[PDB]
Structure 1
Amino acid sequence: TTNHDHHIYVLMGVSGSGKSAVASEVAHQLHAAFLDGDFLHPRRNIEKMASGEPLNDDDRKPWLQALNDAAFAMQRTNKVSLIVCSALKKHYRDLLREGNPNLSFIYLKGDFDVIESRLKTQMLVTQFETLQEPGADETDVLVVDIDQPLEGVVASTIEVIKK
């Protein structure tokens, strides 16, 4: 039931890296399916998040699981699928990869100053702390330079789904 011709792109990166804005535009340009993963967070996680707490590994497990099922669902009937999901850790990425050999990552990149100077500084401090940038041991990960205008980021995102 995996359609190896079909593909899922997880747009990943810290909060404020413009993930949603990119995925939406790219998806309209490409007529792709699009799922903002924030929406799948379980009520508990949002309470915690909204209250001002940063989540941990076990808060995210059930969420990542939910993204995994939705990628599977989406690759059934869409040639190209986009999922916004921060996927900060390598272990989280692995959870998304399971049973999804046709799923890969677009890492919308930038460092602390760019992002901050793009915009709660603390939230942002903790994301970068949690971020584990994917090394040479993750073959299915492409990177986009977000130190550019939205339109250029979208286009680089496009040239990478089409490369």
Structure 2
Amino acid sequence: TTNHDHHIYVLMGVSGSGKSAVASEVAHQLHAAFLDGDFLHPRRNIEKMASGEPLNDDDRKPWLQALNDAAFAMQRTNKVSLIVCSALKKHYRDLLREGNPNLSFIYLKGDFDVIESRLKARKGHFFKTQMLVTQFETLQEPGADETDVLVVDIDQPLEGVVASTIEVIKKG
């Protein structure tokens, strides 16, 4: 049922760290399945969000379980499946891990100043520094004790992180 020769990689990291760009390119070049985790939020969450209220860990819980389940499905028919999910808290990672031993994470790791300039570089985008601060505040970095976590250096042009991500995926 779990297909141990198929693997799932959750692209994680704070907002602006490259999750969508990297994951978009990596799936293209690898012919891999690709799911953006934001699309699994229940109707409930989309409406809360539209109304400007910020989700809570109790709201994230149903979203994450659906993420879990979608990972379970993707691994039924693809050797390599990529999911985009910031996954800031260890506890979110545990919820994704459950029942998916063939799941691992690729942490797109960068420090604050690198990500900030990358967020600023978008024409017309009004940058609120506080948004990023909190991202980093919320971030619970996966340490070495989290052994299904691979880490990729973002202080690199898009092509590099894409390559490092590929290397990380192919490394076995």
User: Which bin holds the TM-score, normalised by the shorter protein?
Assistant: over 0.9
C-alpha separation in 2, matches of 1:53 and 1:129: 19
Task: List gaps (5 residues or longer) in structure 1.
Answer: none
Q: TM-score, normalised by structure 1?
A: 0.94
Which 10-residue stretch deviates more, 133-142 or 41-50? 41-50
C-alpha separation in 1, matches of 2:46 and 2:134: 17
Measured at CA, do residues 112 and 51 of structure 1 come closer, stay the same or move farther in structure 2, by a change above 3 Å?
farther
**Cα displacement string for residues 93-142 of structure 1 (whole angstroms, at most 9, x for unaligned residues):** 00000000000000001111111111132221221111100112100001
Which 10-residue stretch deviates more, 101-110 or 129-138? 129-138
Q: TM-score, normalised by structure 2?
A: 0.90
> Does 2:13 correspond to 1:28?
no
Shift of 1:51: 4.8
C-alpha separation in 2, matches of 1:124 and 1:46: 22
Shift of 1:54: 3.7
Cα RMSD for the two superposed structures = 1.3
Shift of 1:66: 0.8
Count of matched residue positions in the alignment of Structure 1 and Structure 2 = 163
**Cα displacement string for residues 16-68 of structure 1 (whole angstroms, at most 9, x for unaligned residues):** 11101111110011110000111112233334445554432111101101100
Q: What's 2:83 paired with?
A: 83
Verify the 8 A CA contact 1:54 1:123 in the aligned structure 2.
Answer: no
Verify the 8 A CA contact 1:64 1:95 in the aligned structure 2.
Answer: yes
